[PDB]
Amino acid sequence: DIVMTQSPKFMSTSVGDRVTITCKASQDVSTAVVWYQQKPGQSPKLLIYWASTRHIGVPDRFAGSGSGTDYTLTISSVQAEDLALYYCQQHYSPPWTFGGGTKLEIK
Amino acid sequence: IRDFNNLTKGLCTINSWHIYGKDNAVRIGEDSDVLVTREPYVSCDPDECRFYALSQGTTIRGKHSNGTIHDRSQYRALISWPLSSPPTVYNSRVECIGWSSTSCHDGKTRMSICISGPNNNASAVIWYNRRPVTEINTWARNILRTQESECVCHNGVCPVVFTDGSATGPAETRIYYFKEGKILKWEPLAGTAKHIEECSCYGERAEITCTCRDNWQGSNRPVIRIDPVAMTHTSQYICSPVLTDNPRPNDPTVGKCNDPYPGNNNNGVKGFSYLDGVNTWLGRTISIASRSGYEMLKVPNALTDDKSKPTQGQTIVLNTDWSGYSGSFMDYWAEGECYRACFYVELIRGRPKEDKVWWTSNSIVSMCSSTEFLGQWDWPDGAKIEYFL
Amino acid sequence: IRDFNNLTKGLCTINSWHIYGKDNAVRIGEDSDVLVTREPYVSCDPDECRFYALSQGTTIRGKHSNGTIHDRSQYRALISWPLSSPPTVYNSRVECIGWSSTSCHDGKTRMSICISGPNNNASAVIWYNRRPVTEINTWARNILRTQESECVCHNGVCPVVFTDGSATGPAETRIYYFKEGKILKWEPLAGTAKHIEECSCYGERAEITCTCRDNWQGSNRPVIRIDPVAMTHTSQYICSPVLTDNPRPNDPTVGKCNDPYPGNNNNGVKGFSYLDGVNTWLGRTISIASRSGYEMLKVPNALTDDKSKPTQGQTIVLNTDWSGYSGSFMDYWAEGECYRACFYVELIRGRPKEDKVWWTSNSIVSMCSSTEFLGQWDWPDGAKIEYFL
Amino acid sequence: IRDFNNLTKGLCTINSWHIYGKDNAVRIGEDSDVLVTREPYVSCDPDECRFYALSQGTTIRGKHSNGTIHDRSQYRALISWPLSSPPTVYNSRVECIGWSSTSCHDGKTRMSICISGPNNNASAVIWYNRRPVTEINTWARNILRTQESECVCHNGVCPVVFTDGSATGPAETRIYYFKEGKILKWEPLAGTAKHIEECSCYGERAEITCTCRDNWQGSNRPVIRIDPVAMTHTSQYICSPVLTDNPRPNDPTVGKCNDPYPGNNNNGVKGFSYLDGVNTWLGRTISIASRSGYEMLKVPNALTDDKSKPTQGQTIVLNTDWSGYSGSFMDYWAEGECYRACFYVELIRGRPKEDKVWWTSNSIVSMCSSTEFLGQWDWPDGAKIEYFL
Ligand SMILES: *[C@@H]1O[C@H](CO)[C@@H](O[C@@H]2O[C@H](CO)[C@@H](O[C@@H]3O[C@H](CO)[C@@H](O)[C@H](O[C@H]4O[C@H](CO)[C@@H](O)[C@H](O)[C@@H]4O[C@H]4O[C@H](CO)[C@@H](O)[C@H](O)[C@@H]4O[C@H]4O[C@H](CO)[C@@H](O)[C@H](O)[C@@H]4O)[C@@H]3O)[C@H](O)[C@H]2NC(C)=O)[C@H](O)[C@H]1NC(C)=O
Ligand SMILES: *[C@@H]1O[C@H](CO)[C@@H](O[C@@H]2O[C@H](CO)[C@@H](O[C@@H]3O[C@H](CO)[C@@H](O)[C@H](O[C@H]4O[C@H](CO)[C@@H](O)[C@H](O)[C@@H]4O[C@H]4O[C@H](CO)[C@@H](O)[C@H](O)[C@@H]4O[C@H]4O[C@H](CO)[C@@H](O)[C@H](O)[C@@H]4O)[C@@H]3O)[C@H](O)[C@H]2NC(C)=O)[C@H](O)[C@H]1NC(C)=O
Ligand SMILES: *[C@@H]1O[C@H](CO)[C@@H](O[C@@H]2O[C@H](CO)[C@@H](O[C@@H]3O[C@H](CO)[C@@H](O)[C@H](O[C@H]4O[C@H](CO)[C@@H](O)[C@H](O)[C@@H]4O[C@H]4O[C@H](CO)[C@@H](O)[C@H](O)[C@@H]4O[C@H]4O[C@H](CO)[C@@H](O)[C@H](O)[C@@H]4O)[C@@H]3O)[C@H](O)[C@H]2NC(C)=O)[C@H](O)[C@H]1NC(C)=O
Ligand SMILES: *[C@@H]1O[C@H](CO)[C@@H](O)[C@H](O)[C@H]1NC(C)=O
Ligand SMILES: *[C@@H]1O[C@H](CO)[C@@H](O)[C@H](O)[C@H]1NC(C)=O
Numbered sequence A: 001d002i003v004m005t006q007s008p009k010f011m012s013t014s015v016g017d018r019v020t021i022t023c024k025a026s027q028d029v030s031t032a033v034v035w036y037q038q039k040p041g042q043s044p045k046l047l048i049y050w051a052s053t054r055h056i057g058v059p060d061r062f063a064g065s066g067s068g069t070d071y072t073l074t075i076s077s078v079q080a081e082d083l084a085l086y087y088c089q090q091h092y093s094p095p096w097t098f099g100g101g102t103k104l105e106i107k
Numbered sequence B, C, D: 001i002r003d004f005n006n007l008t009k010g011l012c013t014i015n016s017w018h019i020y021g022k023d024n025a026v027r028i029g030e031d032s033d034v035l036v037t038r039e040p041y042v043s044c045d046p047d048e049c050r051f052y053a054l055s056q057g058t059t060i061r062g063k064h065s066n067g068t069i070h071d072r073s074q075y076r077a078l079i080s081w082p083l084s085s086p087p088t089v090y091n092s093r094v095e096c097i098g099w100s101s102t103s104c105h106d107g108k109t110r111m112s113i114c115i116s117g118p119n120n121n122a123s124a125v126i127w128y129n130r131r132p133v134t135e136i137n138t139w140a141r142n143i144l145r146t147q148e149s150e151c152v153c154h155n156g157v158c159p160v161v162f163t164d165g166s167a168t169g170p171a172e173t174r175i176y177y178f179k180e181g182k183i184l185k186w187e188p189l190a191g192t193a194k195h196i197e198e199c200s201c202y203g204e205r206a207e208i209t210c211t212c213r214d215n216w217q218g219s220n221r222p223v224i225r226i227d228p229v230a231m232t233h234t235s236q237y238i239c240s241p242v243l244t245d246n247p248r249p250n251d252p253t254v255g256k257c258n259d260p261y262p263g264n265n266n267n268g269v270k271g272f273s274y275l276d277g278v279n280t281w282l283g284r285t286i287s288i289a290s291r292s293g294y295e296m297l298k299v300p301n302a303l304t305d306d307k308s309k310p311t312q313g314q315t316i317v318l319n320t321d322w323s324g325y326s327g328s329f330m331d332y333w334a335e336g337e338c339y340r341a342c343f344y345v346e347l348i349r350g351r352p353k354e355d356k357v358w359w360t361s362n363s364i365v366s367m368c369s370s371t372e373f374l375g376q377w378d379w380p381d382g383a384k385i386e387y388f389l
């Protein structure tokens, strides 16, 4: 199916800077990428769909970009409370396939 | 009728919608010879209303339906078949060859325009009265496209909106004013609209209103209002926070009358609206990310008010079912004090969300206004992707 | 119209061609009931243009399509179906029974001629107004044949070219002048033309021009120009070095106006040309040895100049795709200052180059002139011989 | 036309026959939806000639075609479809329900008669102008039957021959004279004819001539000549030794004008003849024991001479191919000095000689006269009973 691939898997940035998570698909996914964020010990929250459209109330510092098979999620002014697992997910054809997550550690 | 049509009435009050036509194309085409189509619409002669759509040159069941996700090829043609029959190999009629069209009846006979060719050398030839009258070559060399719903005429003049150039940027939109298949005049897009795609139009009281698609930055829709008598136009966006393109950001509280509403970029769906003061209804997908479901909401003064919110509504396809392109048409030769607003929804089926099959195809639901407040039902395409396996 | 047609206009300027009609017969006939045909053409009534072809009495998919490489049998018939529908069992109309035809509308109704029989006792019966009026028995006992494209009429007189006798030699060609399905007069071929087969004709300004096939020694095509008013004709060959039969030798630098151009012997393909001074366009296969590809070249004064070379051109079917028979037709009852030149290409499919299947059949592409210079695309039959296995 | 037809002309000279229509029903019906029929015929309106036949309520390929050897059931109906189309489920039109029919156009509209019911309580209802006008119950309680080819009218009067009673004996034949679907008068068979079955009729110069079938002792055919103006008739047999029923004894040298020619007993086939002095042609199977082949022989004065032998002839179906029912029709509304004699042959296929399949069905060949002497071909149904296995 479309196989979503995330690497790196652990990332660190200090408070205030940018980090940019990379996610990649196995075939043209035609800008159908969703990004969830799963805060440690909580449920996933939908951050961005169609690669850039932020959902109701996810702050502008979170910005999605991407095209073809390459997508990337950026967070600016990393907050201490931004520590979490970030998953990308294709939403172009069933089954919906998620990337393996990337952990954000705050340096 | 044997005389040109003049848009002398205004809309009728829209207080709910009633079913006008239903295809059932894909459910019947599982055993009969139905053609794979896409980009449907409906258009009325003085004499009859007929369903219109772009065909793909194969039947759903034949092996050549593999690959019909593709938009334009040289086996697409604009066909016509009777209201609520499926588009059969045996009862369809080809109006022209091409992969983008518009067609309308001026009162005496009808204009049909098909566009064709490679993306860098496309042509439009305008058929008037089942004979080719005029042709127009490409002007910006990048997929010359047009309406995908009917054009509207007033005293022989039928404005037609074409776009040539990027879908991800500035493109070259022009309004052409044909009469008897000849070009009277044409002009560039003028107004605050940033990009134009697949306009859905209707006319009343000597003015033609088109609701279109901003594929480059809008989630609110551009409106073009054309004066067929002076042959001029203006463009703006629907002021309402009830955002109606798809995909879209979540509806705000204040909209944007002169600019694209920001959020989804480089995407869209064809859609329509009856914009008539308090009598305004808007159509939109129920889903924000996909072509599923379809509702009609009454949002009074949506065109001009940046705080317009719905006050009545109607569900046409449930969000658990697929929808697709929508557009407007009216029976201008219907008897009576006003015009009955009608619309159609394209119900897309197949690739890419239902990839278990290799075709993309669709069926039609159309509704028309009533002044009664009628009960609502929903209207699913209806086929089971599992019986085609 | 209710009055005889008179060819009172001249051609329009041909500055590129635009698609008029496309069948998609073989791609649709993989799942629907399309009839196996061959030798197509198009012809217009005052009222409608319809596709015309010789049928073989079986559908592509039925087991009886095995063997349709064969040209003439008693299950062939000349049928008619609406412009750009496939020739379906259910929407076709038989004009007569036979294996060679010509048909044309004189303005009041139409003439259709089918030829039939054993190769040594063939007959032609001329149908006027869907009733059999006159018949003609064979005169040289060896496959009486005729046009395979429409005849052209002027004030009720419709010249029709027939050949009876060898295809590998001298044969007996006669020009017949019918009116209301009766024989007014007939004459033997007169001119410098050595052999005549399958003429493609059009008329303008009271003169009928036929471009034909020299099956016995030509690679350049015989032209017959007929005067329907005095009922006389002359024949010559196209002077141009742009050789247009197929198969053909490689184009020379000086052609031959009064003789066959030497090289391929005992073979050919039906083909057409609009011969109008500087406004001259010629059609030909792109391949020299086979029916693949099809281009239209502007070769000014090709008829009279033995050094005429192309000055503009247009690719209609790529050389990587199959073409076949071509011929001319015009909508004489189209409104306007001049006549729009049109043509069709037969796209043959099946045996013998694609022998994996046991049928031979074909589909249609037709184009008509424009004065704009329009972008070109190519137009493949489109089916995959592998889905019929 | 809008006025009653009057048979004001005589026959044209018959000097050979030319093909008028060919079906190819069974070869096309191997892949398309053709209906199983039997007992075909052809009949002309002022407007069009159409093929007519008795249908069996199933398509050749569907499983319900098993058992259609059977003549009469309540799923048979008299249908109509355009000249030379196959009798398709989709282009056929039912004129009435029943298992024996006759139909004809009086000039203003048409009469169609279907007979139905159990063999001991059969009814005929006469449809005039697609509405049921009159009905007639059985009179001898044993399979009321009628023509199986068209009736002929003169000034509104259309004589129709019915037989009720044994097919192996004396039966009750009556000539009915309808006008506008009402019974003007009727009379019993009068003449020297011993039994009457399935008359084939034509009219010229105000007299209607029917050639029929003696199922009980004849091998020569009964002739009934009717005067539609005085509404009287006489019957006799064809005097000629060229015996034309089937099966038949070998042709003698002296025939029998007033009696059955003795030899085969209790069998026959429907057949026709144009009886016009020296201009007389007779049709017959080539085989003496079976429905195979079909030839037309010129036998001058066959009606009156008991030594008439053929002087010219024409082979229509080879003896190595199947034939079947034949009958006459003429286009009475064809323009010109005389009437063109036409006929059809039913080409039966299936059970019982080709029992490998379980259906019986048929196709049509029709020919019409010419004054030219045209070359002859033969005309096979054409299907291979082996592709249906
Ligand atoms: C017999 O039939 C009659 C006639 O049909 C039935 O009566 C009708 O029943 C309808 C359903 O109850 C009713 O429609 C509703 O009317 C209200 C007005 O009071 C209108 O606001 C409703 O529209 C909103 O809600 C629907 C779902 O209920 C949404 O799909 C729609 O988009 C509207 O909500 C969204 O947009 C609004 C404007 O921005 C927001 O305020 C709202 O938060 C919401 O936003 C989210 O969703 C969007 C996508 O869904 C998304 O883009 C956005 O970003 C947010 O996430 C609705 O139209 C009819 O008015 C009523 N008609 C009559 C004549 O009474 C009756 O039920 C039937 N009877 C029986 C017994 O079955
Ligand atoms: C947008 O669309 C427009 C409009 O279509 C495009 O512009 C057009 O582009 C055409 C292709 O470039 C162009 O056609 C050419 O015009 C020239 C005149 O300058 C003409 O000579 C060309 O014809 C020869 O070449 C073609 C292939 O290019 C051959 O197939 C053809 O047979 C001609 O060559 C043969 O015959 C000649 C005469 O004897 C010989 O001189 C020549 O050697 C050659 O002979 C061999 O080949 C024969 C078989 O192929 C064989 O029998 C013989 O024996 C030899 O072996 C060609 O028509 C249009 O004029 C041009 N039109 C316009 C309005 O500009 C444009 O490209 C598109 N734009 C984009 C961006 O895609
Ligand atoms: C180009 O086309 C033209 C036009 O078609 C061709 O010319 C035509 O060619 C026909 C065939 O040669 C020719 O027909 C014959 O005409 C003669 C008159 O001279 C006529 O007698 C012939 O009919 C008898 O023979 C045929 C077979 O040849 C039989 O099937 C038929 O029944 C006739 O014979 C039987 O009945 C006769 C009368 O009783 C008996 O005398 C005879 O013995 C025989 O009886 C037996 O057979 C019966 C069943 O078959 C059975 O019931 C009986 O008991 C006995 O057993 C035949 O019609 C055309 O006249 C001629 N026309 C023209 C205009 O010339 C030409 O060939 C073609 N050219 C080329 C180059 O191919
Ligand atoms: C149509 O409307 C124009 C003005 O919009 C008017 O001048 C013309 O006469 C009208 N014609 C008809 C037939 O209504
Ligand atoms: C069409 O469908 C087949 C399977 O039905 C698939 O394997 C193939 O790649 C598809 N595309 C084409 C051009 O055949």
Ligand SMILES: *[C@@H]1O[C@H](CO)[C@@H](O)[C@H](O)[C@H]1NC(C)=O
Pocket (backbone or CB within 6 Å): C003, C004, C005, C006, C155, C206, C229
């Ligand atoms: C047609 O043309 C002939 C001369 O070519 C002329 O005499 C005749 O009157 C014309 N008739 C019509 C109806 O144009």
Ligand SMILES: *[C@@H]1O[C@H](CO)[C@@H](O)[C@H](O)[C@H]1NC(C)=O
Pocket (backbone or CB within 6 Å): C066, C067, C358
């Ligand atoms: C028809 O096709 C078959 C295979 O489908 C072939 O073997 C046979 O010879 C062909 N010809 C005839 C008359 O069957």
Ligand SMILES: *[C@@H]1O[C@H](CO)[C@@H](O)[C@H](O)[C@H]1NC(C)=O
Pocket (backbone or CB within 6 Å): D003, D004, D005, D006, D155, D206, D229
């Ligand atoms: C038809 O014929 C009858 C006599 O047979 C005659 O009296 C009658 O007036 C004729 N009518 C027409 C319209 O020919």
Ligand SMILES: *[C@@H]1O[C@H](CO)[C@@H](O)[C@H](O)[C@H]1NC(C)=O
Pocket (backbone or CB within 6 Å): D066, D067, D358
């Ligand atoms: C019909 O055909 C089948 C075989 O196809 C045969 O065995 C059966 O007896 C026939 N009759 C009926 C009524 O089924």
Ligand SMILES: [Ca+2]
Pocket (backbone or CB within 6 Å): B213, B214, B215, B216, B217, B218, B219, B220, B245, B246, B267, B268, B269
């Ligand atoms: Ca948009």
Ligand SMILES: [Ca+2]
Pocket (backbone or CB within 6 Å): C213, C214, C215, C216, C217, C218, C219, C220, C245, C246, C267, C268, C269
């Ligand atoms: Ca040649």
Ligand SMILES: [Ca+2]
Pocket (backbone or CB within 6 Å): D213, D214, D215, D216, D217, D218, D219, D220, D245, D246, D267, D268, D269
């Ligand atoms: Ca008998």
